[PDB]
């Protein structure tokens, strides 16, 4: 099966006031499908940044 | 916010958006290219004479 994996972006939210730092990393996504793996409340932070 | 300002992206802009070249709204990307009327070289006294 012909797959194509682009990014394995590793996020981090223990940094203080790191919202800017996590913003640049997430912009480097140009794929139709994203396989997100995080925690329920961590997803809200990620989705809001994506929002 | 999307990511089309730096890296290999240069924006070319008319003199309308540049406007007052003395004030930069701090939201224009660095390396912005604009075409503007020649005010620095030839001043007002030349314009009135012309």
Choosing among B3, B5, B6, B7, which should be mutated to test the A contact, i.e. which has the most A CBs within 10 A?
A: B3
Q: B13 has which bridge partners?
A: B34
B1: which 2 tokens?
Answer: 């916010």
Q: How was this structure determined?
A: cryo-EM
| End-to-end Cα, chain B, rounded Å | 46
Yes or no: say if B34 and B14 are a contact pair by the CB < 8 Å rule.
Answer: yes
Q: How far is the C-alpha of B37 from the C-alpha of B19, rounded, in Å?
A: 10
Contacts with A24 (C-beta within 8 Å, 6 or more apart), sequence order: B3
Q: For chain A, which residues lie within 8 Å of any Cβ of chain B, measuring from their own Cβ?
A: 23-24, 27-28
| End-to-end Cα, chain A, rounded Å | 32
Closest alpha carbon within chain A to B2: A27
Q: How far is the C-alpha of A44 from the C-alpha of B21, rounded, in Å?
A: 41
């Amino acid at each position: 099966v012909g797959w194509e994996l682009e990014e394995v972006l590793l996020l981090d939210m223990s940094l203080d006031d790191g919202d800017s730092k996590i913003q640049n990393q997430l912009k480097k996504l140009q794929s139709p499908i994203i396989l997100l793996y995080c925690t329920k409340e961590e997803a809200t932070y990620i989705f809001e940044v994506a929002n | 916010s999307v990511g089309l300002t730096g890296y290999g992206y240069t924006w070319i802009v008319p003199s309308l958006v540049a406007g007052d070249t003395d004030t930069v709204p701090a939201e224009f990307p660095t390396g912005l290219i604009s075409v503007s009327y020649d005010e620095w070289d030839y001043g007002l006294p030349a314009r009135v004479r012309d």
